[PDB]
Design a protein around this nucleic acid. Structure first.
Ligand SMILES: [Mg+2]
Ligand SMILES: [Mg+2]
Ligand SMILES: [Mg+2]
Length: 115
RNA sequence: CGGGCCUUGUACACACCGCCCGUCACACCACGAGAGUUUGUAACACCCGAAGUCGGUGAGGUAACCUUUUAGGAGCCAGCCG
């Protein structure tokens, strides 16, 4: 990729994010604005993908909520995320965990790493 | 044709101008059948699997106790797994 696009966008890259990879469990603290009030909704879930480069990098987290799978895809460097905290590092064998979309319950379990 | 007497059969006794059977028509009621539709009951097979007990683990943590004292150790426990 152009150094020029890299240079224009460098200022908007967040530095405060922890290293995570697909299979890690995050709590993503999302700024939310229902009404005029501002509050933090937490989205806890498995990272199922992380694609793209630089300011365009996104990640997707998946949770089962009330018996329904939910995925939220965020720009890595969105200012709408207050913070990300890694709950547990998973042991997976690939970059994209789309096979989890078809699994529920015990079949959908990811082993932890001592990282 | 009307009547009299004996006898006999009779489901007749308003007493044969008696009684009475089945369809058909009409109304109402209950019931059966009926392409189906719908509601519920008790099971069964498989999938999934909470809580909890129990059994594994426990590289993590750990007032009481043993050895010793800045300690290991025992036992305990979170978590994990069945
Ligand atoms: Mg990548
Ligand atoms: Mg005479
Ligand atoms: Mg009927």
């Amino acid at each position: 990729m152009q150094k020029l696009i890299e240079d224009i966008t460098k200022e908007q890259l967040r530095t405060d994010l922890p290293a995570f990879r697909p299979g890690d469990t995050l709590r993503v603290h999302v700024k939310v604005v229902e009404g005029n009030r501002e509050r933090i909704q937490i989205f806890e879930g498995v990272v199922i993908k992380r694609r793209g480069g630089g300011i365009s990098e996104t990640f997707t987290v998946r949770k089962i909520s009330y018996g329904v799978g939910v995925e939220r895809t965020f720009p890595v460097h969105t200012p709408k995320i207050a913070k990300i905290e890694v709950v547990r590092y998973g042991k997976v064998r690939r970059a994209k965990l789309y096979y989890l979309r078809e699994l529920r319950g015990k079949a959908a379990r990811i082993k932890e790493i001592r990282r």
